[model samples]
Target: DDKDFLWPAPNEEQVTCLKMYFGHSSFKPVQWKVIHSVLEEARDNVAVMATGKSLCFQYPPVYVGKIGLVISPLISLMEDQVLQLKMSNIPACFLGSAQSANVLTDIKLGKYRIVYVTPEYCSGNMGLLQQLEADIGITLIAVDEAHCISEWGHDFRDSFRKLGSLKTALPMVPIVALTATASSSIREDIVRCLNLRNPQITCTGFDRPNLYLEVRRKTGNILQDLQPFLVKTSHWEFEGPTIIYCPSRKMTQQVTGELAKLNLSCGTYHAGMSFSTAKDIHHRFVRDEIQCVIATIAFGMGINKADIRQVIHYGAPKDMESYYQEIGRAGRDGLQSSCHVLWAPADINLNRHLLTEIRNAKFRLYKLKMMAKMEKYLHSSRCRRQIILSHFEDKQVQKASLGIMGTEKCCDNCRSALD
Candidate 1:
């Protein structure tokens, strides 16, 4: 019998490591390909997928027997990721300014298998990365939420642009760029900014057929109108975790208060909240102690929950990328889920006013254009999924509106037409 050399099954040691660390019996095809490229082929790579991307960069370094440097976008995200790794008995540590000097000394002493840091930290302390490389040896560098490096990305961060220096600083280490959403143009920007050398790029389909998309016209009392969806009735059983996204912190509090009035278990997370409170809510939500979490954009990226049944946009998202990424958070476990966008004409005016606060005129103009595209999505009569997939230039647009699971209606428009 002939054996396939290029894509072989996980060896016994690798399988044991997978079970011990991440508790997975198998790797997805895309993950296996990226793993092969990094571990076997010894090359840089870019992975653009919805979920399960952690293992691609994570498994390789552990398998290769070296430390992995993960560049995360937010402190909260780093904290959450490191917490998960420690829970599984995997050695991981996140370094931040809040930590004591002892942490750095420990890191230098090779106390961690994976080290997570922010781009801001990297740019500020370039010498530390060199020291880390020299001391313990960095086998790979993984940039989480890699789209932030690209100007075309919705959440562009100036700190991420400085990360182009990583290639020059650690020339020998393989770099892996990971993100949930990035269009073709955005992908090019990421590759150019990261200065990746002949990377092995793997992009799975962007389509999430399990998500039932819908857009509702904002009513005089939005919370009252949403009662049926929030409160479970015998006719419709809605028992699962939900996330309600508001455009502003004020709205986040207001929504949380309203949800409480309906006797629903919920939590609020925003920039204005204290660090302790935010941490508590995040912990509660992940543990299934909180049924719903009302938050602003600050809560979107760090979320690693797999069973979010609904992601309700209390108002229209600022852009297509943000809207898509937020909704993508739902139904991540491949279960049938619903996404509701409560949009109003006033949201356009509000966004226009908000964009005026931006100092960069050119970037502000680009944001306005993106906002217009989202507005079009809100009002378009076509299938909601098609419009979203097309915005990301996803070729799977034809697969949209096939209905959620076995249902006949996929979006609010489809249901209206059916009636």
Candidate 2:
């Protein structure tokens, strides 16, 4: 009976529904274009679209029931990728860190159009390339969060440097690298580091007009300042969830506990929690079971909820890249959202001490530079986006500038002090 059982057909109706909800008649324009060029045309090489951090895989509209390969980290974001693919009725096999070896082995035995892997995982396995060469089924090699290849990026992982060697291994396979937060220098570094050959590039602008950027001066008493800001601004009007980022796990717990005491449905998340617990908290936040989540840097990357209304940073992020990425999480649905940074002199000192904890001299220096950049942003009398874009070597328009004295918006410094 088991042998005679038939496999379920692809859910074409669900795919249509998802496409409508995502505001595309079909897959996103860039995704559709890449799929056509690689899968339908059978192009030997092509690189397209590397913006918004995660690389999405979309099959041609004709081949509605095709299978694809996805290699990614074992994190919440990757899970969302799987869900998206499933919604499209695309049979996708995701090989995360734990099962990468097995997935690579399967690729040799058969064909997979989409292949995803981290630089570290790919570089560590030499046999995978031989398999790719044997099968000749490898069409696209996508590197997610590709900015990590640069030493200058805030999330630098040493293993990412080895991704450059892929050029030597699969010279014919087209490489597509994606990242949400990259300055011009970082973008160039990613291409150079990966040895990408005259690849096509697509950049969705970093600007999110729906998000109103604000910085608040934190006096010695934080709670006093938070109360008035919450009251004056109708911050609670939006039913969508919010995220409050603190510098440490201890602080995240404390803040969440304090908010809970005020009868708010809030939770805390950080790297300090077990993986399972973190996963649970993440799901709760996504489901709106908790109205707010107070977390550290660990919470933002894989977040896919469309209606995040606000993201508050209780302390300053280490650098502009991180700051932009964190705040960008808000207003993803193109609705008005708020980004507030509670800054104080003590925050700078704490960040400095945090940098010193890095034992490696080279890494320590990098951290210090990152902190300095954050400090510059805090003190700058220029537009917030302009300051951020300037770091990437992009020229900013005078009108686009934010966060400084005499600028269009009067942030906390220019406004009345909190009582």
Pairs with steric clashes in candidate 1: none
lDDT of 2 by residue, 98-154 (tens): 766666565555533344455556678757665655555455566666777789988
The reply for model 2, stretches above 4 Å from the true place, is 1-132, 135-204, 229-240, 393-419
Runs in model 1 deviating more than 4 A are: 1-174, 177-204, 232-238, 396-407
Best model number under TM-score: 1
lDDT of 1 by residue, 102-198 (tens): 8888788777888898889878887888898898788789998899988767999888999999999889888999887735556667888999988
Q: Give the TM-scores of the predictions, in the order they appear.
A: 0.55, 0.52
Clashes of 1: 0
| 17 Cα displacement, candidate 1 (Å) | 40
